[PDB]
Design a protein around this ligand. Structure first.
Ligand SMILES: CCCc1nc(C)c2c(=O)nc(-c3cc(S(=O)(=O)N4CCN(CC)CC4)ccc3OCC)[nH]n12
Ligand SMILES: [Mg+2]
Ligand SMILES: [Zn+2]
Length: 326
């Protein structure tokens, strides 16, 4: 069995230090790492956040769970694949450690965030929520057109967590388990950009007015959602060579959806899904940064100044894209 071999290889390998793996760096790149190495990085993230120790995770179970998560991403989807999920978790790790966000959260919240980050795009088909609704996909029918992809991702997450030999939450009490699942679901649903756009104004206003208070349960939940989005979109903050590469992957996925819309819906795709409008990418990236990204990274820096590198990188990438749009 090809999978039992993968499991043994992973379980027997040494876990290099966080320093060696560079996973505390906001500028981290997975490009030169093998699949096995990304799995080892993932073990190191769980380990250095004290999750293995505090929740008594069995090494073998953690290894299998990480392998189940990775295998449940589609290798044929250009951007929303295991590497995106892995990078999102890495950004979460960096924000918690280098950005000092770990001191503001509970162990259960950190556990949920890391699991959620790794699991948030599980089995992503490479098409948008609106595409799924307009084509009457089984997913859209299943979830009544509401955060379709995100409900699917959480259901896939739960399926992995409840499957034999992958139960990494077996060391939690029942009350802890129920709490953790509730947070994971909210954290995964938060990655629906429509929900981010809907909820972020409250967060930005609380920050502007110096009223942000993490002891208020609603504000804590709001913050966790915002942090999920910050990590989900973090490729936009990477050094230029990395961001330019990831942007090509994002455009590939979009153009592939546009091809599907041409054949299956017999429509002309919008500019962002139109491969013929490839020349417009730079201005669309500037638009994405201005409307979606910049305000979030600005707000996060007010929460913790040590998260500044995310804002800095985002600003630098805006300058490079704007230069290419003239
Ligand atoms: C859903 C992809 C979110 C995302 N992550 C990253 C790193 C990127 C990136 O670099 N660039 C794009 C990105 C975002 C927009 S957008 O802001 O206008 N917008 C279009 C519709 N979408 C999806 C439903 C919401 C926002 C437009 C073009 C984009 O990329 C072109 C390569 N989006 N993106
Ligand atoms: Mg998603
Ligand atoms: Zn994502």
């Amino acid at each position: 069995e090809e999978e039992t071999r993968e499991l043994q290889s992973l379980a027997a390998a040494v876990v290099p230090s966080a320093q060696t793996l560079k996973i505390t760096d906001f500028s981290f790149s997975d490009f030169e790492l093998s699949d096995l190495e990304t799995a080892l990085c993932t073990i190191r993230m769980f380990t250095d956040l004290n999750l293995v120790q505090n929740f008594q995770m069995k090494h073998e179970v953690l290894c299998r769970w990480i392998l189940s998560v990775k295998k449940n991403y589609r290798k044929n989807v250009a951007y929303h694949n295991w590497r995106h999920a892995f990078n999102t978790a890495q950004c979460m790790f960096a924000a918690l450690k280098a950005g000092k966000i770990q001191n503001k959260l509970t162990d259960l919240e950190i556990l949920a965030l890391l699991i959620a980050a790794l699991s948030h795009d599980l089995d992503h088909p490479g098409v948008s929520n609106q595409f799924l609704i307009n084509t009457n996909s089984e997913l859209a029918l299943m979830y009544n057109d509401e955060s379709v992809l995100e409900h699917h991702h959480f259901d896939q997450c739960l399926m992995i967590l409840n499957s034999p030999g992958n139960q990494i939450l077996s060391g939690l009490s029942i009350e802890e388990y129920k709490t953790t699942l509730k947070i994971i679901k909210q954290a995964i649903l938060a990655t629906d950009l429509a929900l981010y756009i809907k909820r972020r104004g409250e967060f930005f206003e609380l920050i502007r007015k110096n009223q942000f208070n993490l002891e208020d349960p609603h504000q804590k939940e709001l913050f966790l959602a915002m942090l999920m989005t910050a990590c989900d979109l973090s490729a936009i903050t990477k050094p230029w060579p990395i961001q330019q590469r990831i942007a090509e992957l994002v455009a590939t996925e979009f153009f592939d959806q546009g091809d599907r819309e041409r054949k299956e819906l017999n429509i002309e795709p919008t500019d962002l899904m139109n491969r013929e409008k490839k020349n417009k990418i730079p201005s669309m990236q500037v638009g994405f940064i201005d409307a979606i990204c910049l305000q979030l990274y600005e707000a996060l820096t007010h929460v913790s100044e040590d998260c500044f590198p995310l804002l800095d990188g985002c600003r630098k990438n805006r300058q490079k894209w704007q230069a290419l749009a003239e």
